[PDB]
Amino acid sequence: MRGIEITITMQSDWHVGTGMGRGELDSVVQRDGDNLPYIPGKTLTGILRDSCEQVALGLDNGQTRGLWHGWINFIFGDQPALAQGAIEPEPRPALIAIGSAHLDPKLKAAFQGKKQLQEAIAFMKPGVAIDAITGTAKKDFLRFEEVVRLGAKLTAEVELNLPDNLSETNKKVIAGILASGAKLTERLGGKRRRGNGRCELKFSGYSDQQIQWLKDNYQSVDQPPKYQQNKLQSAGDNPEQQPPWHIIPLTIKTLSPVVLPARTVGNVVECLDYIPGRYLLGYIHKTLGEYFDVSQAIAAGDLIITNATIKIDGKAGRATPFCLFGEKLDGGLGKGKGVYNRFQESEPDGIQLKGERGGYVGQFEQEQRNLPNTGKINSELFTHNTIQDDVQRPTSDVGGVYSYEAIIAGQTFVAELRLPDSLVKQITSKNKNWQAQLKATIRIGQSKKDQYGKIEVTSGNSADLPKPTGNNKTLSIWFLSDILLRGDRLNFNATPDDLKKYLENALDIKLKERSDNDLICIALRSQRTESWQVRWGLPRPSLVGWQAGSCLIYDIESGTVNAEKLQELMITGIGDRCTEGYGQIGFNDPLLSASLGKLTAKPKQSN
């Protein structure tokens, strides 16, 4: 259920802190990707929940645990951070997901390019402490604070995903509670207790009549129904995989910030700069599981979804080869000069180079006359707190502050959904317009119910299958995504001669390492991955492997390299867990083959 909206009217000057000042200002407000003031969804849910818990007090006769606190835990999800002891029931997610409240889209658009207006929306408010004795301004307590002009009207999407089995009676209960919380809410943001941030909050389509039904009925309610996971259902229908591989490009645009946990570490989460293919599998279910047994296809490996990398040159960007080295002072792809493919080129005389590591490179070709185009992902560290709900401030006991890296809005990504003709025949014969139906908006990532995670998905037209250049002298390998391999005892490990064995067996050839003293044969780095089985509420086993952009090259010792087998491995990917996006690989790419030391990069209203 979508298209319920919260509306907010600010009736006094209002302030949502960054938790810090800047320069001459001791407090500055959070601004969105369009530099306007806005109310973060995490604040909005936090405030609305708080008012709902006030209702629960009024109905539980002040009992801090009870039937109606049950309902609030049902509606807004459990807080497993604060409950402690041997709690047996799984922590339930919230039914209610709430965006950030933004300004009206037309007003927002009007400010485009008009920097001085974007400043004028805020203004400075003073503050001072008075010495109780001398009755004068207490010096070094003078304080200047940014606040946002009252009268702003803001709105946020709400989505409810009520259980389909939910009794009609309970729907009116939930509507009753949620309506009551909006009515009872009066303030949000900073210095609520001193008159900033007074507001009205209303739901579209809830009114006093919803509260009236509760007031007439509430004594008749019960505890909420117990939670249930939405399990899979396999069917076994899938026709067995046959070539060709069709390749559907999916374009992803970050409409809101997105949090993609690279490594959790205490109260902070670092974020990736690509979207793991695993995130999209839920979307695959929600749009194709009517047409074929998605779960069977995954288990068979009949489906691959790549990672999403930033779009460059109209296509998927490619993680920078670790064979590239830049001049330690003057060069590298960041400086658009002095980049040496150490598979082919000697180090210049005297000048020490450093290997490239980060970032993404676009297209390259046998003679581009220019270094490949370089992509970058803009990211920001968002910050949040938890209020200890009785003293009504953060405390170390409640965990204080926490923060997320996020990919910011307007970043754009590409991924490929790869399907055998066998499934495409089934899908197409059931629906020729399916590629139109792939257009959807979905929520992925960490904290996905709140301000984070809104992405657009949009199919392109079908791409061409990749066509690796065969070369019977040398095999060269670029890891376009992280590579996971089992050791010979099925443990994870990272030993390159395992990969040597793997590739030469898979291609049915023999390989020898490049022996030259000044051309490096191998440039790898290890990789280890935190992950969670949301299907089961436990972490996934720690995946270990080689990170994307690792590269290596070999001389072919004997045999012949089949161009068709190369194409197959580039489409399917090598190693373990390819289906969710690992294992993606590129052979004999011209970038690894060419020498680049001489080259440079190319030169780079409102209504």
Binding site: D13, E53, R194, G195
Partner: protein, 174 residues
């Protein structure tokens, strides 16, 4: 749980300026050096903070600086048991009366030797005229029964008109 309020109290009425008032902003709608604070809509208003601290100041005199009492009404960031204020003070817009507008007072320094205006010691304070009105914007949350006796005293002090607000409190206003 959200702060276990037993009884919320809304406490409201009309505050009347018995003298002219000034609350300084940082630039204001006045042309003056000493210019009035205004809300984001440019209306003349009493900032909730300035009123709240005025009330809390008077409460400090009543309780003889007994902070262990003050901090259980007005809150404290330091004490692990305290935190948020139980009194709440919203902003109030000032209704200057019909056909009336902000006055400007002149101010001057008199050289104590020559008896004449001292060089540079001139200023021109804007003031809200006497008899302007604004809403008493208080709310109070009681975690126990009744109404705190010191808070009852404060309301009597407001009915007595004993509490001064804003700038220039010694020298005509507030």
């Amino acid at each position: 749980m959200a702060r276990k309020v037993t009884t919320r109290w809304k406490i409201t009425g009309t505050l009347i300026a018995e003298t002219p008032l000034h609350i300084g902003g940082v630039g204001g709608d006045a042309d003056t050096d000493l210019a009035l604070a205004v809300n984001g809509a440019g209306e003349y208003y009493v900032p909730g903070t300035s009123l709240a601290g005025a009330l809390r100041g008077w409460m400090t005199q009543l309780l003889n600086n007994d902070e262990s009492q003050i901090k259980d009404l007005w809150g404290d960031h330091l004490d692990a048991k305290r935190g948020a204020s139980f009194v709440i003070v919203d902003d109030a817009v000032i209704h200057i009366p019909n056909n009336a507008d902000v006055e400007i007072r002149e101010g001057v320094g008199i050289d104590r030797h020559f008896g004449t205006a001292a060089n540079g010691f001139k200023y021109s304070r804007a003031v809200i005229p006497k008899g302007s009105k604004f809403k008493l914007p208080l709310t109070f949350d009681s975690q126990d029964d009744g109404l705190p006796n010191a808070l009852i005293q404060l309301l009597c002090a407001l009915e007595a008109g004993d509490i001064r607000l804003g700038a220039a409190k010694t020298r005509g206003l507030g």
